[PDB]
Scaffold this active site. Structure first.
Site, PDB file in Angstrom:
ATOM      1  N   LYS A   7       0.845  -1.209   0.000  1.00 43.84           N
ATOM      2  CA  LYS A   7       0.000   0.000   0.000  1.00 43.84           C
ATOM      3  C   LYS A   7       0.880   1.260   0.000  1.00 43.84           C
ATOM      4  CE  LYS A   7      -3.491   2.483   2.791  1.00 43.84           C
ATOM      5  NZ  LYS A   7      -4.549   2.282   3.837  1.00 43.84           N
ATOM      6  N   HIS A  12       2.725   5.917  -2.471  1.00 40.63           N
ATOM      7  CA  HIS A  12       3.831   6.845  -2.242  1.00 40.63           C
ATOM      8  C   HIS A  12       5.090   6.680  -3.074  1.00 40.63           C
ATOM      9  CE1 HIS A  12       1.489   8.570   0.951  1.00 40.63           C
ATOM     10  NE2 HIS A  12       1.417   7.409   1.583  1.00 40.63           N
ATOM     11  N   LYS A  41      -4.423  -3.297 -22.330  1.00 40.43           N
ATOM     12  CA  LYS A  41      -5.103  -3.033 -23.587  1.00 40.43           C
ATOM     13  C   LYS A  41      -4.016  -2.585 -24.560  1.00 40.43           C
ATOM     14  CE  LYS A  41      -8.882  -0.470 -25.727  1.00 40.43           C
ATOM     15  NZ  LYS A  41      -9.878   0.618 -25.500  1.00 40.43           N
ATOM     16  N   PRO A  42      -3.894  -3.269 -25.712  1.00 44.38           N
ATOM     17  CA  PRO A  42      -2.733  -3.006 -26.586  1.00 44.38           C
ATOM     18  C   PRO A  42      -2.707  -1.633 -27.269  1.00 44.38           C
ATOM     19  CG  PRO A  42      -4.031  -4.915 -27.373  1.00 44.38           C
ATOM     20  CD  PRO A  42      -4.778  -4.342 -26.214  1.00 44.38           C
ATOM     21  N   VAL A  43      -3.880  -1.085 -27.593  1.00 43.99           N
ATOM     22  CA  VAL A  43      -3.980   0.157 -28.368  1.00 43.99           C
ATOM     23  C   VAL A  43      -5.166   0.949 -27.847  1.00 43.99           C
ATOM     24  CG1 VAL A  43      -4.413   1.201 -30.646  1.00 43.99           C
ATOM     25  CG2 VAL A  43      -3.033  -0.921 -30.495  1.00 43.99           C
ATOM     26  N   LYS A  66     -14.090  -0.494 -39.443  1.00 47.02           N
ATOM     27  CA  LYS A  66     -13.112  -1.562 -39.589  1.00 47.02           C
ATOM     28  C   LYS A  66     -13.767  -2.942 -39.467  1.00 47.02           C
ATOM     29  CE  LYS A  66      -8.692   0.567 -39.040  1.00 47.02           C
ATOM     30  NZ  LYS A  66      -7.303   0.502 -38.511  1.00 47.02           N
ATOM     31  N   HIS A 119     -17.704   3.671 -29.511  1.00 51.14           N
ATOM     32  CA  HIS A 119     -16.480   2.901 -29.769  1.00 51.14           C
ATOM     33  C   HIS A 119     -15.537   3.763 -30.590  1.00 51.14           C
ATOM     34  CE1 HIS A 119     -14.069  -0.261 -31.929  1.00 51.14           C
ATOM     35  NE2 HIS A 119     -14.467   0.374 -33.016  1.00 51.14           N
ATOM     36  N   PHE A 120     -14.246   3.658 -30.306  1.00 49.54           N
ATOM     37  CA  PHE A 120     -13.275   4.384 -31.111  1.00 49.54           C
ATOM     38  C   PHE A 120     -12.726   3.425 -32.154  1.00 49.54           C
ATOM     39  CE2 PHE A 120     -10.651   8.179 -31.612  1.00 49.54           C
ATOM     40  CZ  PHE A 120      -9.666   7.701 -32.448  1.00 49.54           C
ATOM     41  N   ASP A 121     -12.894   3.763 -33.434  1.00 52.60           N
ATOM     42  CA  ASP A 121     -12.553   2.807 -34.502  1.00 52.60           C
ATOM     43  C   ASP A 121     -11.131   2.947 -35.034  1.00 52.60           C
ATOM     44  OD1 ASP A 121     -13.884   0.528 -35.822  1.00 52.60           O
ATOM     45  OD2 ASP A 121     -13.607   1.675 -37.695  1.00 52.60           O
TER      46      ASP A 121
END
Ligand code: C5P
Ligand code: C5P
Lengths: 124, 124
Positions: A7, A12, A41-43, A66, A119-121
């Protein structure tokens, strides 16, 4: 249960970074926004324009998704965004990203009523 | 369930002019290191020195903790730290912090076996 030692390290310790870095953004934001739990998350893209401007893309140019769905829209103008990509060295749970500042058109999938980005394409 | 609209905002929105600015370090770190869940932690220090140097404080200058406990130690030397403090505008769930880089002595509580830092008491 998280140990008191762990923790303290969480709350810290930041031995491995410079607080004046501009290139640590993705590492921090991917963590903050919960995209580094279970796996890296890769991208991922972050958009820095106003939420209103991003929502407005759903009323802009219809383009191919896509994934072949028919609900994607491209921004009429380029937008200030940050591209976050996992590095070659990145290995969960130490998720490491290359931060790239970019100005590109965004393509988003829209859904809901009102139709808003869901969603971001891609950035193009 | 998190709405699709909310998920997009979490994953993809960071509206602002200078998202990667060093002034945003505390905002990002406090979020990433889980000190903005439920309420905004008002004050938090991050230490940029090696964990070896921070552990070594547990064998340095004994001092009383601010709360009257007797397991605190002050670093012999100053350390590069970042002080995070809520701004006047900060209000949960929109926690906002002033980031200040300083070099100060740290005071930590040491606990466990081996005796290691378990609490950050103060910077002096
Ligand atoms: N340029 C890109 C490409 C993908 N992504 C994210 O990655 C997710 C999955 O992307 P792929 O299907 O291309 O692997 C998308 O839903 C989006 O959240 C992104 O945020 N920016
Ligand atoms: N300079 C300071 C002061 C407080 N803190 C954090 O805030 C908590 C409470 O501090 P106070 O006793 O000063 O209210 C401490 O447990 C520590 O986690 C800090 O990290 N750096």
């Amino acid at each position: 249960k998280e140990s008191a030692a762990a923790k303290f390290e969480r709350q810290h310790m930041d031995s491995g970074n410079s607080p004046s870095s501009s290139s640590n953004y993705c590492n921090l934001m991917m963590c903050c926004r919960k995209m580094t739990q279970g796996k890296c998350k890769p991208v991922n893209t972050f958009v820095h324009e106003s939420l209103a401007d991003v929502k407005a893309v759903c009323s802009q140019k219809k383009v191919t998704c896509k994934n072949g769905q028919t609900n994607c829209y491209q921004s009429k103008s380029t937008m200030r965004i940050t591209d976050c990509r996992e590095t070659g060295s990145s290995k969960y749970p130490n998720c490491a990203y290359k931060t790239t500042q970019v100005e590109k058109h965004i393509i988003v999938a829209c859904g809901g009523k009102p139709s808003v980005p869901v969603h971001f394409d891609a950035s193009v």
